[PDB]
Amino acid sequence: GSHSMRYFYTAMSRPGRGEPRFIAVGYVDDTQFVRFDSDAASPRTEPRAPWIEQEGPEYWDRNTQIFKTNTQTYRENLRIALRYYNQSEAGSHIIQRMYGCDLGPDGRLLRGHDQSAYDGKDYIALNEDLSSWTAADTAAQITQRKWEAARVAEQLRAYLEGLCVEWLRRYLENGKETLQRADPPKTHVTHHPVSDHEATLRCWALGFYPAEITLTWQRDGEDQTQDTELVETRPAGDRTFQKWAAVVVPSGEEQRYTCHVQHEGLPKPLTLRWEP
């Protein structure tokens, strides 16, 4: 299918408790493969997936240098942000960034990303053209002018079309047994009376990878979106994910309800019902 590589940076100030912590994590799809944490006893890029371990020392050194340099850059960015928002040096603030590349099913670049936030609010984003910026407020317009002056977008475009795509394809090959394997959900419906005249039907999906899934309930073939309780997809801990969707139905009407499952690992969408 389609694949993506993303890096996620978080830089968190903490006045009175040292310099801001910088954490970077790298993912292919829903699989983490590297981490860097400036609070580690020995900060360095660490492997988080078996297929990255084969990379040579030049690889670990290049990425560790980048992350050490970013630690300093985002500490300065946190100081700059205080000035842009007229904020005091007494509070804790957070800068976050996510960047990377998406491939289509052919394997070509579908689109690139580089978006940043301050205190959990959008700050600035590279536009889909990989040439211009959208700033969220007048502070980020100051950053925008700096990056336009420095032609930062041209450098990011070169990374997103080049190194990002090339190395994503490399990781997909080296990790093909896992990164290119979809595991379909194991599905079942459970039944829980809530009273003498209603019962909960809960449609479960377990053991699936990647995380993207659609679970929906129909009553007499009509979607029950407003009446459906849908939990957030959650990690099992073994790389796979879990999810459920529940509806409260009148007792004696259970067979009017069907659960519909869509997942990349399924050749066709699945329809299931309560089987008493």
């Binding site: 290049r62 300065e76 800068i95 700096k146 190194l163």
Partner: peptide, 9 residues
């Protein structure tokens, strides 16, 4: 592979 471009705010 991380990006090496510096993003100075």
């Amino acid at each position: 592979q991380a990006s090496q471009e510096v993003k100075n705010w």
